[PDB]
């Protein structure tokens, strides 16, 4: 579990949003697993805006951060999870690292402020549904 808290904006993996995001949504997509409700009170985060291959993620079932390497931005096949079947995800980036279902919504952050939630896992490799494009995220 776990959210992006920027402005007055919720940003959480579709697959976990609740029935209070949907009433209150501003925002989704499932070919990303993104969704974006709204919120009553300002958030503490800040959204890189970079083209950053090197951060640091929270991983909840080793209750630990791990510096990592990621690739930037693609499309790719992920193979079914507990939450998802087989399917392309958009907008996704890969490290190596240790990644369960319930490790979704930890952060991606590097030196300009949060890159993504972790969204996918298996074998070997974390995935991060990326949150740099969304500029209208900073404002309004
Ligand atoms: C829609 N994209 C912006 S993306 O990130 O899924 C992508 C797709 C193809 C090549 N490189 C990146
Ligand atoms: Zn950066």
Redesign the pocket.
Do not use: E
């Given at each position: 579990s776990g959210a992006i808290y920027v402005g007055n904006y919720r940003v959480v993996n579709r697959h976990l949003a609740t029935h209070n995001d949907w009433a209150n949504l501003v925002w989704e997509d499932s070919?990303?697993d993104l969704l974006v409700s709204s919120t009553t009170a300002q958030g503490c985060d800040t959204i890189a805006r970079c083209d950053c291959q090197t951060g640091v993620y929270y991983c909840s079932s080793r209750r630990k951060h791990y510096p990592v390497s990621f690739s930037?931005?693609?499309?790719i096949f992920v193979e079914a999870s507990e939450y998802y079947p087989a399917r392309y995800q958009?907008?996704?980036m890969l490290a190596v690292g240790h990644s369960e279902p319930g490790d979704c919504g930890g952060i991606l952050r590097c030196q300009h402020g949060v890159v993504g939630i972790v969204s996918t896992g298996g074998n070997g490799l974390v995935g991060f549904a990326?949150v740099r494009?969304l500029l209208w995220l900073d404002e309004e």
């Open positions: 070919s990303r930037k931005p693609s499309l958009s907008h996704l990326d494009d």
